[PDB]
């Protein structure tokens, strides 16, 4: 099964009461694993399998790194605001991560956003930065001049990130490698006079990755889709609607057909 490891950083300049000027959260797939903010100034686990398998020295060392990353983000957001001639509260974001695909191949990404919009995107295959505008192009020229840091980043995305993900996958296997099949039902109902609505609803499934589609006489085809929503108990819910019909649902190597 495909799995991913991601770490986000959020920097907020001049925050209003009750908003940290820095937050950093890690995820394995859709599960929070680590947290840090400028109010607690502590790196903490956000999953019991993370707390149980990592020695206290982990959180002590990452508390210090995160305190430094916080200072770095503060200063980069100031240089960005000065480049754009911006005052007031602005946001700066980072997302780093990797994916272990089901065929065993891997991916890696490192991106930056300014005010919730794309800003800089790393290309680890050419060791270059993709800049969205003149400001980002100024930043990219500085960052691209440090060759060893580009090589470090490639190594981190391709080796270090995959090695951590494999470790965390083993720590949280009873959660992450489990499968809870969906509960799927089809519901028919005349809505507007002469109009019949077909609803295909799925719930109680884990992982959230599911494929839902309506077919007509065994072949394809105006479908409405519902978002994959968390049910609050670790499982998810979703739907698809239309107006011989069959709902097709694919989840964790099992195909399901619900004929009308």
Ligand X SMILES: CC(=O)/C=N/c1c(NC[C@H](O)[C@H](O)[C@H](O)CO)[nH]c(=O)[nH]c1=O
The reply, when asked if residue 152 is annotated as ligand binding, is yes
SS3 168: helix
SS3 83: helix
> Which token pair is 135?
């400001």
Site residues for other proteins, 70-129, by CB under 8 A, read: 89, 91, 93, 95, 113, 115-118
Site residues for other proteins, 191-230, by CB under 8 A, read: 203, 227, 229-230
Long-range pairs for 36-39: beta carbons < 8 A, 24 or more residues apart: 36/62, 36/63, 36/66, 36/70, 38/70
Would you call 194 exposed, middle or buried from its count of C-beta atoms within 10 A (0-12, 13-18, 19+)? Answer: exposed
Q: Which of 21, 24, 38, 184 binds ligand X (CB under 6 A)?
A: 24
Number of residues that bind ligand X (CB under 6 A): 12
Q: Among residues 119 and 206, whose Cβ is nearest to ligand X?
A: 119
162 binds, among other proteins, ligand X, none (CB under 5 to 8 A by kind): none
| Residues 235 and 203: beta-carbon distance below 8 Å | yes
d(CA 60, CA 260) in angstroms, rounded, equals: 58
The reply, when asked if residue 38 is annotated as ligand binding, is no
* 38 belongs to the binding site for ligand X (CB under 6 A): no
Element (H, E) at 258: strand 254-259
CB of 65 to ligand X, least distance (A): 7
CB of 201 to other proteins, least distance (A): 8
CB of 260 to other proteins, least distance (A): 19
For residue 68, how many other CB atoms are within 10 A of its CB?
9
What is each CA distance from 165 to 112, 156, 162, in whole angstroms?
21, 12, 5
Strand pairing category for 183-190 and 196-205: antiparallel
d(CA 69, CA 32) in angstroms, rounded, equals: 19
203 binds, among ligand X, other proteins, none (CB under 5 to 8 A by kind): other proteins
* 96 belongs to the binding site for ligand X (CB under 6 A): yes
The reply, when asked if residue 94 is annotated as ligand binding, is yes
> Which token pair is 169?
């996958």
Q: Among residues 151 and 183, whose Cβ is nearest to other proteins?
A: 183
32 binds, among ligand X, other proteins, none (CB under 5 to 8 A by kind): other proteins
62 binds, among ligand X, other proteins, none (CB under 5 to 8 A by kind): ligand X
* 12 belongs to the binding site for other proteins (CB under 8 A): yes
Tell me the Ramachandran region of residue 188: left when phi exceeds 0, alpha when psi lies from -120 to 50, beta otherwise.
beta
Interaction site with other proteins (CB under 8 A): 6, 8, 10, 12, 16, 18-19, 23, 25, 27, 32, 35, 46, 89, 91, 93, 95, 113, 115-118, 203, 227, 229-233, 237
Residues forming contacts to ligand X in the complex (CB under 6 A) are 7, 9, 24, 26, 34, 36, 43, 62, 66, 96, 153, 156
What residue numbers does the annotated binding site cover? 9, 24, 43, 58, 94, 152-153
């Amino acid at each position: 099964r495909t799995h991913s490891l991601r770490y986000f950083r959020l920097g907020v300049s001049d925050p209003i009461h009750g908003v940290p000027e820095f937050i950093s959260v890690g995820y394995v797939d859709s599960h929070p694993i680590t947290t840090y903010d400028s109010v607690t100034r502590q790196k903490e686990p956000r999953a019991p399998w993370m707390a149980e398998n990592l020695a206290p020295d982990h959180w002590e060392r990452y508390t210090q790194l995160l305190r430094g990353w916080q200072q770095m983000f503060k200063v980069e957001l100031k240089r960005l605001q000065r480049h754009y001639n911006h005052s007031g509260s602005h946001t700066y974001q980072r997302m780093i991560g990797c994916e272990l695909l089901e065929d065993g191949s891997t991916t890696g990404f490192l991106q930056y956003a300014y005010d919730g919009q794309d800003f800089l995107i790393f290309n680890k295959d050419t060791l270059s930065w993709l800049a969205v505008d003149n400001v980002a192009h100024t930043i990219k020229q500085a960052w691209e001049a440090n060759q060893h840091e580009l090589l470090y980043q490639k190594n981190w995305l391709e080796e270090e990130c995959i090695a951590w993900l494999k470790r965390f996958l083993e720590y949280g296997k009873d959660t992450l490698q489990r499968t809870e099949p969906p509960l799927v039902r089809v519901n028919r109902k005349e809505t507007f006079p002469g109009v019949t609505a077909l609803f295909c609803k799925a719930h109680g499934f884990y992982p959230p990755e599911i494929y839902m589609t309506w077919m007509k006489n065994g072949e394809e085809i105006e479908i409405d889709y519902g978002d994959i929503l968390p049910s609050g108990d670790g499982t998810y819910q979703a739907w698809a609607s239309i107006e011989l019909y069959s709902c097709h649902v694919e989840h964790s190597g099992v195909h399901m057909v619900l004929q009308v």
